[PDB]
Amino acid sequence: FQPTNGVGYQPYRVVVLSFELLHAPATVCGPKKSTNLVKNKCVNFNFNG
Amino acid sequence: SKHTPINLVRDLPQGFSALEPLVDLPIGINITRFQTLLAL
């Protein structure tokens, strides 16, 4: 090997993080980013679901 | 769980006291037997 190996011969690091859903607990969330909290106005609220 | 000072020993104390939740681990396993531990 060489420090400047080309594609196909150079080392290839791989991570295979796997998504699993079974009888094991399902602690799955969504892409919910926090937003400012308003008051004294008719609004659609979602606190913890 | 709950903690409360009592006076009786051989019998459970008189009174009412609710217990608050303390831990909610999602262990996701099934348990059919249990045992206590002691310090000697």
Ligand SMILES: *[C@@H]1O[C@H](CO)[C@@H](O)[C@H](O)[C@H]1NC(C)=O
């Ligand atoms: C409880 O026993 C059941 C069926 O008898 C089995 O399917 C399961 O593996 C046990 N549950 C857990 C969460 O391990």
Ligand SMILES: *[C@@H]1O[C@H](CO)[C@@H](O)[C@H](O)[C@H]1NC(C)=O
């Ligand atoms: C400690 O207190 C209790 C009394 O029965 C018991 O664990 C033991 O006899 C005592 N002495 C020890 C642990 O050395």
